[PDB]
């Protein structure tokens, strides 16, 4: 079926197989799911339906859509542009790491499976040469699994602080260059979709996830991992970090408030069904994130079983858990390098698809906002090449010895946290109060046939902005500092630059409001009347 195959190619992504188990391990195992389902009910469905309906209603780019819907709140589109730019800066480095693993994978003995190399330290141990072995005192002397040492000391060569940026890893630089040039090739030759290439490269991530889950539940000691994954602690629910990360993981994994969802709705015709597509896409995305959660947490439950250390500190708990649990799982497969290279090719494919659609949405939005310059002299591909070069040069700062901390900061503060919370707050406030929920419900009725069931309407009015403003205020008053490996206690200037770029991603709405008020002034009530009124026939 063409409908089933095309939809399944958009459910899976890196936000389900890499970011969700990271956020479910860093912010407590089972305590992460309680705000996850709450935001899935109250902010995934309503904001997803809102953005899909608005994108299909206006049927154009994602930043002029807000121009023709509500010209006062046009800064929401520019905030999504900044979020997309930050994402395209650091969404490609995961493909660089996955290429680097693919470089080392083609060997009859895996690099991350034995306890002797140029990078392994003295405190390593095989953890497989004997059943009882000689641990529980080597564990007291900080025993380390070989994959945990391999990642830290060869993949990125971690340094003891963000102030200790070491030499640039040249192999990783070549990996990033290869990722950017294959993304540019996908931009030029590869836009012509369908054929025999979609029947293979769409069900392959689900087959690989299914076989990885089937293996992961078979690993001994996975019962403790699943119990840690599911049984929650309320003391771990007391901090606002879990709530913030759950809500913005909901917003990130659904592409909500990124900016490409308004462009996705514009691709569909005016009479496409928003409600059913939104419901099934959101539910299937939550389900596949949940399944990848089972897989990674079962694997690290086995890791904690084979060590003497408990489940809470057995992996990095930074954004490399998918690069630690998954390389551990593929070692237990018979014919391990085959499954390893197929898995890393899966990661390359499902990261490249999202990067391609993100950069395509960004370039089509920036040439729609500048129509008379980039559509007359054959320079759209030149703009794409210049943007790729610029994001490669700005992206290389995270590939150094200490650049992992910079990547962690921008992952937690660019397409996450306060940026997504503020954009969703102002989006839902705009729709439910400025444009009017009755007018938008009438527009949805004209589009798809039936109005929203008024639960989504009340979510737009009082539920979603209320809960997101509550989470924002709760994060702001009970501030908890960010730690990389759960104990780092970042320097003050690192928090300064993180908050600076998080503000710069979300101060573009009040700045645009201020300059729109200043540019066209007719005193306050006439200004708000002429800015509240929508433009043309939309």
């Amino acid at each position: 079926v063409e409908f089933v195959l095309s939809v399944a190619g958009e459910i899976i992504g890196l936000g389900n197989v890499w970011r969700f188990p990271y956020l479910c391990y860093k912010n407590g195992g089972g305590a992460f799911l309680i705000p996850y389902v709450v935001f899935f009910i109250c902010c995934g469905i309503p904001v997803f339906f809102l953005e899909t309906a608005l994108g299909q209603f206006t049927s154009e780019g994602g930043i002029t859509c807000w121009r023709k819907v509500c010209p006062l709140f046009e800064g929401i589109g520019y905030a999504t542009q900044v979020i997309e730019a930050h994402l395209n800066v650091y969404y490609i480095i995961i493909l660089a790491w996955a290429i680097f693993y693919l470089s080392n994978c083609f060997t009859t003995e895996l690099p991350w499976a034995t306890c002797g190399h140029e990078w392994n330290t003295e405190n390593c141990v095989e953890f497989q040469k004997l059943n009882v072995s000689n641990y529980s005192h080597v564990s007291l002397q900080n025993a380390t699994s070989p994959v945990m040492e391999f990642w830290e000391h060869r993949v990125l060569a971690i340094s003891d602080g963000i102030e200790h940026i070491g030499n640039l890893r040249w192999e990783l630089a070549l990996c990033l260059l290869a990722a950017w040039t294959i993304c540019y090739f996908c931009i030029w030759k590869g836009t012509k979709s369908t054929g025999k290439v979609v029947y293979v490269t769409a069900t392959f991530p689900y087959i690989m996830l299914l076989i990885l889950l089937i293996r992961g539940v078979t690993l001994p000691g996975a019962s403790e991992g699943i119990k840690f994954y599911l049984y929650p602690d309320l003391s771990r629910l007391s901090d606002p970090q879990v709530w913030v990360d759950a809500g913005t993981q909901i917003f990130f994994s659904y592409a909500i408030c990124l900016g490409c969802l308004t462009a996705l709705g514009s691709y569909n015709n005016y009479h496409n069904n928003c409600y059913r597509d939104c419901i099934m896409l959101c539910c299937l995305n939550s389900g596949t994130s949940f399944v990848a959660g089972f897989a990674i947490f079962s694997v690290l439950g086995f890791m904690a079983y084979e060590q003497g250390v408990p489940i809470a500190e057995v992996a990095e708990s930074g954004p490399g858990l998918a690069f630690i649990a998954y390389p551990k799982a593929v070692t237990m497969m018979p014919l391990s390098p085959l499954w390893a290279t197929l898995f890393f090719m899966m990661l390359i494919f499902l990261g490249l698809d999202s990067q391609f659609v993100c950069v395509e949405s960004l370039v089509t939005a920036v040439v729609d906002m500048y129509p008379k310059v980039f559509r007359r002299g054959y320079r759209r591909e030149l703009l794409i090449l210049a943007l790729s070069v610029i994001s490669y040069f700005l992206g290389l700062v995270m590939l150094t010895e200490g650049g992992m901390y910079i990547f962690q900061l921008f992952d937690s503060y660019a397409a996450s946290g306060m940026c997504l919370l503020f954009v969703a707050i102002f989006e839902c406030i705009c729709i439910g109060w400025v444009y009017g929920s009755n007018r938008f419900s009438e527009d949805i009725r004209d589009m798809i046939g039936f109005p929203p069931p008024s639960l989504i309407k009340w979510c737009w009015m009082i539920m979603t902005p209320g809960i997101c403003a509550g989470i924002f205020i709760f994060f702001l008053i009970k501030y908890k500092p960010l730690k990389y490996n759960n104990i780092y206690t970042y320097p003050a200037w690192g928090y300064g630059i993180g908050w600076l770029m998080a503000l710069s991603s979300m101060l573009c709405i009040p700045l645009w409001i201020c300059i729109t008020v200043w540019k066209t002034e007719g005193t306050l009530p006439e200004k708000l009347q002429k800015l509240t009124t929508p433009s043309t026939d939309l």
Partner: antibody
Amino acid sequence: EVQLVESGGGLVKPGGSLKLSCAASGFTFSSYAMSWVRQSPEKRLEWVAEISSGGRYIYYSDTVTGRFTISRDNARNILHLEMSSLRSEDTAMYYCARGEVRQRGFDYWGQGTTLTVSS
Amino acid sequence: ENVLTQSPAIMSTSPGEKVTMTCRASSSVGSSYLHWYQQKSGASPKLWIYSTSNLASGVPARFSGSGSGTSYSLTISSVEAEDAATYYCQQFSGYPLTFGSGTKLEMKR
């Protein structure tokens, strides 16, 4: 429970005009769209006009477009249908149907006001 | 103008007998947009079957719509004296809205 009582209608000259009125009660009139469905004396049913729940999405059939206009009033819960240049072909009995969900149809219909155009 | 037609225009059924009407559409229509109405002799039509599968409030379960695409049908298990009326078929997919010619359910004795 829900009563779609209607008014207006009668005998009008050809080329004249008339103003039909639909009174809706027992439900939120501003939250459901409306339509006028006429019935020919040959018992042939056809749709005439449709106004949305807000009042800015208005559609007409190809046989009465241009000459027929449909109004609304969400305050007093009333509906209107004003026609111009009535011929002998659009004499019928007009119903006041209620259809908002397009997967539900005109679920609640009216009573019917007889309209006669003749010389 | 999705010109809907119905055959036969006139039919007569004895009570407790199999009967199946039809509504042939000129163009393709959605399976969840075609509806069926019932108008008694000298009364306003009421909603009977919506989205060609379901039944409205008060409709007995012996009515059952079927069909998809362009050919649609309305099936009745056992008719009685309480449902001798005229039935029309509508569509909301394309504008302008159209109705069927109308099948008259008659009785014989």
